[PDB]
A paper describes a structure:
The strongest increase in potency of calcium uptake inhibition by 2-[name] was observed for the mutant [name]*-[name]. To shed light on the structural basis of this phenotype, we crystallized [name]*-[name] in the presence and absence of 2-[name]. In the absence of 2-[name], the C-terminal (cytoplasmic) part of S2 in [name]*-[name] is splayed away from the binding pocket by ~4 Å relative to its position in [name]*-Y466A2-[name]. In turn, 2-[name] seems to glue the S2 helix back, perhaps by virtue of its tail amino group interaction with E402. Y466 in [name]* is highly conserved throughout the entire TRPV subfamily. In turn, a more loose binding pocket, such as the one observed in [name]*-[name], might cause reduction in [name]* affinity to the S1–S4 lipid and, as a result, increased affinity to 2-[name].
Residue numbers in the entry:
A (entry chain A), B (entry chain A): 28 to 637
Write the structure that this text describes.
Amino acid sequence: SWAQSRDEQNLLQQKRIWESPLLLAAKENNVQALYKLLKFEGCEVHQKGAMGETALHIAALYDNNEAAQVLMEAAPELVFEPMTSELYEGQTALHIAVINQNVNLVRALLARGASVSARATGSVFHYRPHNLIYYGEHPLSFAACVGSEEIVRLLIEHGADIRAQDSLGNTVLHILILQPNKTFACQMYNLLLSYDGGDHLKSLELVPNNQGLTPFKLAGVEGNIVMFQHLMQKRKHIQWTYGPLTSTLYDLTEIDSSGDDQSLLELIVTTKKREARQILDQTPVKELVSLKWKRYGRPYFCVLGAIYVLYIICFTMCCVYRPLKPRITNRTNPRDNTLLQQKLLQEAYVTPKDDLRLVGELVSIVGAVIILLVEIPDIFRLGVTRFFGQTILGGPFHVIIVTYAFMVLVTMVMRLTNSDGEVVPMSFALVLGWCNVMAFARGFQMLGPFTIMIQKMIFGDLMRFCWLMAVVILGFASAFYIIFQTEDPDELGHFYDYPMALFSTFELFLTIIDGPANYDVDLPFMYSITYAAFAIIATLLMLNLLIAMMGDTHWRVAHERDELWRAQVVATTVMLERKLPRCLWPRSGICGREYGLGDRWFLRVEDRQD
Amino acid sequence: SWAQSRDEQNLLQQKRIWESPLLLAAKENNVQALYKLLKFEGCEVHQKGAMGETALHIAALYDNNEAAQVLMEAAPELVFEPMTSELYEGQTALHIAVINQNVNLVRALLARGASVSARATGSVFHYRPHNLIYYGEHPLSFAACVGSEEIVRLLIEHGADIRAQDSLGNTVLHILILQPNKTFACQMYNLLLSYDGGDHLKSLELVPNNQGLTPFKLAGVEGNIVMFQHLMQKRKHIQWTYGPLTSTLYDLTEIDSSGDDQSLLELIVTTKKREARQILDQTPVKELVSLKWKRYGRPYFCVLGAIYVLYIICFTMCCVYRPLKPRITNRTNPRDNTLLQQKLLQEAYVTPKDDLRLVGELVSIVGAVIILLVEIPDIFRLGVTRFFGQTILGGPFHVIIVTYAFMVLVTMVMRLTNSDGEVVPMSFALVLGWCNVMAFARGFQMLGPFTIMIQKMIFGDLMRFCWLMAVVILGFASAFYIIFQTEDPDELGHFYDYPMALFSTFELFLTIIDGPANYDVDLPFMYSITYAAFAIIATLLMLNLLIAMMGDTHWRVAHERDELWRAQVVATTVMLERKLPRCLWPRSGICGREYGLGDRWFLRVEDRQD
Ligand SMILES: C[C@@H]1NC(=O)N[C@@H]1CCCCCC(=O)O
Ligand SMILES: C[C@@H]1NC(=O)N[C@@H]1CCCCCC(=O)O
Ligand SMILES: [Ca+2]
Ligand SMILES: [Ca+2]
């Protein structure tokens, strides 16, 4: 594959280093050898290694200032030389010297005039899961990441540009946010800002990423709390300090949802990173989301539920009082078991009690069109995750609400044609319409976190486990059929045909029925033996499942599911504000006009320190 | 709303500070500016800010002794000036100087003759949940709360009054008890007591709150153990010290229940604060309550149960041997399913076996009147929580005991009228009369804590969850009805009408019935499919509930429910002593007369230190 390729080439490089006597001597710091290979013998100083590296590139990898200095003295054009291989296209000797924090070699290379604008476009410097580190493409980006404050200023002194962006359009500021050592990177972040021009506009912090993000905004998405906390000092203003109390004012500009999708809050709820959830708990955001749902948010969510419950409960009223079913053809004799009395083809009737039934069915096309006005913007504008990431209209579940309206439309087509299968399209809507009601259990009270468990269980662990429950049924259900195939099924015929054999055993797996048992007639010899094993094995599987549930329930998951529910409540609040009109739901905070301090909206939060 | 108002005004204040050049210079400590605004230009020194603040009020907020001193020198009448706004009505410059612990400014203000009796009646100084801190209304109250021992004595030296009460009638002593830093406040508590007159009477500790509480008494209600422990030294007397043993005598005056509702014990069991429960565990109280229930308490509780069980079991005897039911009208044919043989209108009968039935019914009016003598004092004197806080007659449950007597009275009205619904009023009393018997399981042995779980479950989590169980039934129960509406219900008609469809599915949710299944006749196509989903979903909901139970069971809750039960046993003991006559249940302890040490009752408790 591709992992083999890079593993092959690192091995292949070492052979070239061993074979090449010049490259070997630079690797091994043999100073006396290098003079013998350059002065007396005319070895081609511009020797190209396996990775297109120069003799100086190897002397920089393994820190070798003595061997590196000889190469610059004998040939000074090697400093500008970049590596030519695909994995390392663009990398220069200065990149290697900065990475290893070789201060004396960096100073010697800059004195030679090495470019501070050379990009390392090689694939190994790309931001990808297989790459272990991402340091950008510029030598200043490398210096800032390793934390050598000495080299960062020294690189700037020779003309390094902080505004320089990589292929992804990330400045050196953006690269620091995507780093493990958060505590060290904060101090380095400040140092790079000191070289900013000083103008309020064109500030490097305002320079955006290619995908529209900014350093402050990116920190929230990536879940870097340390940088998020540190970056907040820029945009928070202390009003006054009275004893232990402190009224502090927050800028609330890039945080709030006014700037279209540039809102930080939308990025948190849409992103897949679990880490970003902790950002909404932070003290500028936590008041914002709480004030959002406690007032203007919670009522509208319940109002929709009241409308939704009403819309559903009326639709069921149409189903229970459905067309008349008198059975015109008394077939009866063929399949004498058959008992049907069917509704079907009467094309309405005279309308006293019948009149109200049409007004209830007229509500179906409203939902069929309102949800069609939900399904039209189900591929319009958005459409891959951008719906599943934007869907807050229900959010969880509510993929089935659009299928429900399809069943409503199919049941309309089921009418006016009077097909036998009238019940099957009408039946699906009743289960799905009420099962979706518990989507409103999200938020509400303390059943919301409960609905998260079952929601997870339905779509995750069940499917895999259900396969294991599907097996063993195949063994026992088909077995029982074979034993009972011989005997007369008139009495105790739990498995008369194969589709009933599976269904009867499936019921038996959850012990719903009493279990097949007749004492008037003697049963087959094998039923008594095979059923004993079925009763035991079914209990073990249920006990082990019950014990397997304890895979969760650790106190951290009690905090986890609590944070997941409250995060999904915040999720509900944002798109409700998005779809709803601007006249309702006034913007949070107070405007910075009429007190000419800002021209933006500020949240006044006061706190107390114990 | 109102939170917006104060947020608006803090923003509005800063604009006035910026706009007002005088107020700005005091905020910014620009000393050179202040002289330019007062000497050369005649700026109206008595400038009123947005909050009615003076230029000195701003100079005190932000600690600005240099700017504050200039304002007093140019205009000395600003010191007496209070803020006029509603939020800050009454606050003076001395209040602000004390709060920020500006010692030099407090000394300068007192030298100017600032009042030490000025109250801060502004709404932001009220004791309310929205206010973060409560420091009282007097400048000495502020000094004591921040803990500046230097200012407290200095404020007293210039005529501060410790006896001064706020609008709620709380002294400075009461304010300290309602503070977070319990360990610091104890030392400050003593310092304020040193300035007391020294007379045993009129002591500031005896000064009561408006609602009848005193500092020692309030500490128990508020659950401040540190202050409760510290305050106990005042009223505990060591008899002797023999080796490691120590006989210490406790005053037991304000603690015990003799002084009407002033008893501390009644305040603990009646209050809603969870913290007060730990106070009853304290070593002066724990012996008192234990000695109370172990002797004189536990027997009377069981004696009432023996009487109650006897009263109930006889009442059931009347129900089982009820009027004769021969069915006079053999209607039968209309609703041929009907089978009734009804008792109804015979107006008693000749009395051999019948005579004893009346003597048992005569017991019903006794309970109907005895509980009427419980329902008459169910609005008399008390009545909102003052019953639910005073009810110990059962305590938990025993709201239903008064409804039981109502059903007894209704069943009496059901008799002498011979109505069809004879069973329905009589049936409710049997369930409620015996379900109330487990109220006596409170206390008793180790089932008492068990009864607390179910008691909590019935009235808390169930109702919310039951709604979620009510949903999904609507989908499946109504669905099953539709499938089976077509077919002949003579055989396997679990859902023949809609009210039976819900009830049959509700039973099926808990898997009580075998589940509808017939093999002689072929079932509808949809029943087999829809029932499979019902069996699965019902199990998940029950499994997730079982796992959701683990929301408790942490070892802290095992201590919590144990402390809740033992606290509710203490609850039972207090009102039993209240309702019972004084001749029974002698007062705990030994009187201080006949050993003229006290004239009050003392509990002799000896302890040993390891
Ligand atoms: C092979 C290259 N040639 C060399 O002399 N050092 C390089 C080794 C890899 C450094 C970058 C590895 C990475 O980014 O994952
Ligand atoms: C606004 C008032 N004017 C001022 O100069 N300081 C005050 C600030 C509020 C102090 C009390 C806040 C509180 O009690 O919650
Ligand atoms: Ca069973
Ligand atoms: Ca059964």
